[PDB]
Scaffold this active site. Structure first.
Site, PDB file in Angstrom:
ATOM      1  CG  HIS A   1      -1.702  -0.765   1.688  1.00 17.06           C
ATOM      2  ND1 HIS A   1      -1.765  -1.828   2.393  1.00 17.06           N
ATOM      3  CD2 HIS A   1      -3.271  -0.844   1.218  1.00 17.06           C
ATOM      4  CE1 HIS A   1      -2.741  -2.412   2.600  1.00 17.06           C
ATOM      5  NE2 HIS A   1      -3.930  -1.878   1.709  1.00 17.06           N
TER       6      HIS A   1
ATOM      7  CG  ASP B   1       1.396  -1.013   3.571  1.00 10.18           C
ATOM      8  OD1 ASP B   1       0.901  -0.496   4.628  1.00 10.18           O
ATOM      9  OD2 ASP B   1       1.092  -1.877   2.830  1.00 10.18           O
TER      10      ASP B   1
ATOM     11  CG  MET C   1      -1.730  -5.854  -6.114  1.00 10.14           C
ATOM     12  SD  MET C   1      -1.599  -5.375  -4.531  1.00 10.14           S
ATOM     13  CE  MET C   1      -1.995  -6.676  -3.166  1.00 10.14           C
TER      14      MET C   1
ATOM     15  CD  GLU D   1      -8.742  -6.941  -0.658  1.00  7.85           C
ATOM     16  OE1 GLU D   1      -7.756  -6.807  -1.515  1.00  7.85           O
ATOM     17  OE2 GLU D   1      -8.751  -7.093   0.487  1.00  7.85           O
TER      18      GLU D   1
ATOM     19  CE  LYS E   1     -12.806  -7.008   5.909  1.00 12.23           C
ATOM     20  NZ  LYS E   1     -12.178  -6.193   6.692  1.00 12.23           N
TER      21      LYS E   1
ATOM     22  CD  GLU F   1      -8.083 -10.873   2.158  1.00 14.98           C
ATOM     23  OE1 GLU F   1      -7.399 -10.205   1.865  1.00 14.98           O
ATOM     24  OE2 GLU F   1      -8.428 -10.653   3.617  1.00 14.98           O
TER      25      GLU F   1
ATOM     26  CG  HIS G   1     -12.497 -10.047   2.693  1.00 10.85           C
ATOM     27  ND1 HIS G   1     -11.893  -8.836   1.573  1.00 10.85           N
ATOM     28  CD2 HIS G   1     -11.909  -9.846   3.678  1.00 10.85           C
ATOM     29  CE1 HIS G   1     -11.000  -8.343   2.371  1.00 10.85           C
ATOM     30  NE2 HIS G   1     -10.891  -8.815   3.598  1.00 10.85           N
TER      31      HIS G   1
ATOM     32  CG  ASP H   1      -5.538 -10.658  -1.316  1.00 14.69           C
ATOM     33  OD1 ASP H   1      -4.511 -10.325  -2.013  1.00 14.69           O
ATOM     34  OD2 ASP H   1      -6.029  -9.570  -0.917  1.00 14.69           O
TER      35      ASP H   1
ATOM     36  CG  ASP I   1     -10.546  -9.532   7.642  1.00 18.31           C
ATOM     37  OD1 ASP I   1     -10.147 -10.498   7.471  1.00 18.31           O
ATOM     38  OD2 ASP I   1      -9.910  -8.378   7.404  1.00 18.31           O
TER      39      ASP I   1
ATOM     40  CG  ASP J   1      -6.705 -10.478   8.002  1.00 18.58           C
ATOM     41  OD1 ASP J   1      -7.213 -10.342   6.892  1.00 18.58           O
ATOM     42  OD2 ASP J   1      -6.748  -9.432   8.646  1.00 18.58           O
TER      43      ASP J   1
ATOM     44  CG  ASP K   1      -4.617  -9.220   2.587  1.00 22.41           C
ATOM     45  OD1 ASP K   1      -4.049  -8.983   3.700  1.00 22.41           O
ATOM     46  OD2 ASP K   1      -5.498  -8.387   2.231  1.00 22.41           O
TER      47      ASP K   1
END
Lengths: 393, 393, 393, 393
Positions: C52, C55, C86, C179, C181, C215, C218, C243, C253, C255, C291
């Site tokens: 990102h 980031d 990406m 993406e 969600k 994802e 998600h 993802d 979420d 992860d 992810d």
């Protein structure tokens, strides 16, 4: 809807004080001074304020700092007349508590967590609080082999009985209220629902002063009926406190204003709190506390607006719920559906098991097909309920 | 995976006998003769069979019919050696029970329901069953004003204490096992989860012979962790029976073969049943019962195939779960994550609350930031668990 | 399990670098340097790293700072050989994106979010990324009247088509992947599932270069079948990136590591990615991006362990999934269940609707009762997959 | 609340006629005659009635029988004035559709399901229906390897495009509306939500005449926002019909009366149907169809009560929703929250992507911290809606 301190509306410091940080972003609001929270709340019509030890006193506070903060805070309370009916401990934000407080796998952490609780019982007792809430937010796991599950309940019990023993010993007029949550921040949290909280209390040595603090949204994250859950707590005479908020489904803990989630469920919770059970029984008598968070999209307007909205919604629901039971048409529909009929014991007084197997009319010659034709008319009793909720009738 | 009757795999008559009718369609399979079910099950390696009174004896059966069916059924059992460890009552299919059995609003229906239960306790006792299961499928509501919730728990209690009193009185070697379900067929069912079932038992006069019968899929319809839920039942010494099946999320009761739903959760349930708690404690010792339904897409092949698949999956999981705890690498990871460390009491023997507040090392000089650096290494302990499940290591 | 760069295992900077703040607590790990992330990922066997904008480059970073950061970053890339497949934009953390980026109600925030996206497309081009991911994390609402729902989709279209015209005008070799969600951080996020994402793309002017980035977790937050959703994306030739992670149910979420959520679904997800469709069709050949978030209970040894575990988990599943389809007993089971039969067209070559209507053997003369006897044998087929997954077969 | 035929309240034959069998029990009501359904619906104020072929004509009915049934039916229609706006096909009850209709793995079942659909299109034309609804209730799976997921969508396309070409070739004035459902009766149903339904339609050859038929409860079984989903359908000009009912959470399809599930969502659903979008746009103007089931606890007085309650509920919400938008305090609150502001284009007329990039006040010179202070005031706006819904305002 005009609240008054006789309504017993309580709010946490962390509720209007929630700054707006969630897991995908930072705070949208500046920190709230606790003196102002107290003053503001008092002008809205609140009855009292509640806090987590660290909402007020920073983790690292020196003693001179601690005393200053308490003098300021005690000043504000004296000035406004606000009560402090519940106090709780933060056993979930500092990194030390990543595995739990009472049920952490590290024994030294468990010791610090319990020590931290004991000191906070003193504070609570000095503030005149009647309830001590325990929310074990970090007690649980993400993965199934992370814990010995029996040892986790033993550890839990040990911490809660130690706190209860200490209250008894010190002569304090406080009761512990366990607060269940199914998940978040952990994948699975120990004692996930009201039922699991009630169950655990029956295994404690000093369970007589240990009860529940159910939260609307928490029960709704497992898809349960909040009203049914508090009805069981009430029936067992264990409903010591109540946290009202709103949630719109099974997902992260939303903490919306009470009534801003499942509306019909909010109406029946108010009805239960206000009208009790149709056939009589115990009634809930403590504070109506709001553990919600003002959405982060809203500025400081919005924070007092949402605080105001909690009390408005409760009051608006109360008025409707009183109108509903008072209605003669609703009382007839209730009789027709067998609501009062459920209150009559199944057995006749001094009729035993053997006596019942033996009654011909009860089994051998009972006309099952004819008893099955009764029109319970539950849809129409629900339509009457909804029409009172909408202010149609 | 070769089952043997020493495995204690039990199946209900209604499980392999499920004809295939669901709410959107009719049966895809012809009715199964109970004599054949018994024979077939015995050749698969099952230990026993279970039934609902009406799975065997039709509701309207005359006495000559009843006696014939029991002679046939007792014949089959004698012939194959199958046991009948649990018997239950059908208080949900006839139209009379649309509002419940024990908690119906109509008092006459409540009386018939309880009479029906009492007669079935006799049958159960004559069949040599050790457990009497109660599943209150119709006890609940679709709408919140349909019931007085306190009266509903009173009625419930009255029915269960009456049944327990009767067992005590008659000298029968039977225990009652309550079976929780959150919803379906009703919108909300009374005593929704294991926690609510445990709680209710503590309010009964004869609660000493009243325990739980948790079902995998039922707990998973509220999104709870099955393994955590049975761990609490076990810790309270209330796990009297267990129903194993599979479910793939929060939705209608799927009743898939055990292991065909949440697989990692099925592995940890097997581990708990087989290995007990890491630090020791109570162990579950009864039958492993399968209350599933062969998917309606499958013919009679499929029915014995799916019965076979239950036992295969359990056995395959057992082998992996035994390999997992035996592994030296897993034992070190367990020590490292503090699994055994959780088993040590928090307090030192004869150390009180006051003694702990007072220890400097425990609170005032405790280095919180330094205790928080521990790497619990729960991800790696979960990776080891999954690699044993996949037969990788 | 020995991952190598042709596996196309790519990782986000934010995954291993996730420090641990959730909504109930503070970061538990020290920040992770970006150069150190590249070195570690490359040693472990990753093929690429993703980020990102924020980031890597602070939101406040001066131009001087920007260029310095990008030089050390590009140097590490050069030293290790890691690609950057990406790049994505952060339109959720700063307080300014509290009501969204592209669908914020404030027009000047919409233009600022779009300008931040356009600048980020120049950086994406510059790093050689083939995919530009868009996660619209703040596009949505808590309350239903907060937005004009038609306008929100119009503002979402404007942003995505502006961005896509910019790629095309500049001739960047880049595709947009949206993406989906369902919720978190908003109550309701717009374009909540694969389906909504695919539909919305068909309304764009520049849809040809816009696809999806599904994802695991998600789609599993709405209780959907992730294999079925990515199958539909793939069937429409819209699966541009993927993802992979773990989710244990309908909740926040989580992860987790890929394979530490729904294990059987992960098995079937690996089968579609690697093996494609039984009858032949499309195949996805992009990168396998992870992810996820290293659990907060763990230190840096857990962070590298967790990165290693994603790769391991995909490779163990891959080998079992290849063994599974190669197996002749499974191929015969597939044949029996009609897997290949579904691949045949319903109508004969040259058959009109009128033709079949009129064909007496497909309706009038059809024996529906006979056709209904077929044993699809889906249960035995599922048992074969699990046995293969458990490495028993 | 006095419903009249221009309200366009239509009802399915299967709703009021639903006799009560669920998966745990037998029908509780006597069958309802079709002629008697027409008479009752028309007296109550309905505008039209809808049916599934097999609701009216038995699956076994001879040709003689068919024609007799249709004469009494057409006669009742004629006597009452009730229209028949939508007709649908039963591809789920008979045992032959156990693996689906259009996506059954068996090729001869696929042709039989398609021929049954084509014949039903001739009857739809014949009754003057404008919409032909397709609910693919059995299209899906319990297990992930049961189907070739690409082939299933190819077989689903073949069926829908065959059917649509048949409408077009015959020049029937009829549109197809697909009805999504996430699960039940299958574990996973293909095209599970509005989104999947909309996407799939864009892959058809004859998509121009294919749209959607969203149902309240169905999207709410995946935890989705029904107003948001029908908004997206409407925005794509694909909302061809709508099915209204109640669902209290993620569980089995309840089919309650519209308004007896999620009350606040129903309020906002009525607002979009009646009022459309705040800034102007599309409006849905078809019929308001009620696809629900009269609770099994109730007799025929409940059945007619429940039909009356759907209509009442929509009319009470309608009046509150009109009062709500008309209110000047609400219009100012809307203005404050930026509801109208979202209607403005992000880019100025003639502004390119390059233009905005390059506009220093939208990025470089943007004060993000200042922009972030804005109080969106979404909480006050929601409070205004609920107060209006409670008939307090």
């Amino acid at each position: 809807v005009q609240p008054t301190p006789a309504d017993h509306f309580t709010f946490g410091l962390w509720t209007v004080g929630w700054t707006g940080a969630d897991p995908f972003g930072v705070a949208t609001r500046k920190n709230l001074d606790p003196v102002e929270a107290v003053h503001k709340l008092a002008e809205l019509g609140a009855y009292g304020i509640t806090f987590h030890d660290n909402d007020l006193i920073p983790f690292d506070a020196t003693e001179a700092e601690r005393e200053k903060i308490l003098g300021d805070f005690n000043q504000a309370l004296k000035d406004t007349g606000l009560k402090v009916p519940m106090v709780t401990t933060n056993l979930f934000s500092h990194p030390v508590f990543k595995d739990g407080g009472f049920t952490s796998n590290d024994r030294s952490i468990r010791r610090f967590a319990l020590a931290k609780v004991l000191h906070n019982i003193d504070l609570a007792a000095e503030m005149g609080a009647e309830t001590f809430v325990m929310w074990g937010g970090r007690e649980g796991s993400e993965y199934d082999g992370s814990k010995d599950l029996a040892a986790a309940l033993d550890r839990m019990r040990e911490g809660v009985d130690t706190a209860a023993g200490y209250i008894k010993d010190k002569g304090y007029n406080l009761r512990i209220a366990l607060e269940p949550k199914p998940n978040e921040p952990r994948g699975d949290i120990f004692l996930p629902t009201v039922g699991h909280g009630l169950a655990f209390i029956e295994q404690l040595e000093h369970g007589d002063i240990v009860g529940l603090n159910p939260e609307t949204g928490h029960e709704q994250m497992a898809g349960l009926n909040f009203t049914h859950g508090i009805a069981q707590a009430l029936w067992a005479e264990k409903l010591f406190h109540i946290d009202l908020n709103g949630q719109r489904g099974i997902k992260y803990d939303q903490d919306l204003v009470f009534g801003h989630g499942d509306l019909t469920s909010a109406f029946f919770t108010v009805d239960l709190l206000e009208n009790g059970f149709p056939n009589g029984g115990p009634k809930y008598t403590g504070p109506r506390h709001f553990d919600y968070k003002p959405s982060r999209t809203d500025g400081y307007d919005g924070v007092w607006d949402s605080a105001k909205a909690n009390m408005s919604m409760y009051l608006l629901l109360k008025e409707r719920a009183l109108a509903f039971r008072a209605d003669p048409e609703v009382q007839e529909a209730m009789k027709t559906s067998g609501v009062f009929e459920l209150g009559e014991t199944t057995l006749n007084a001094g009729e035993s098991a053997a006596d019942l197997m033996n009654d011909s009319a009860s089994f051998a010659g009972f006309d099952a097909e004819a008893a099955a034709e009764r029109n319970f008319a539950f849809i129409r009793l629900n339509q009457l309920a909804i029409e009172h909720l909408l202010g149609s009738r």
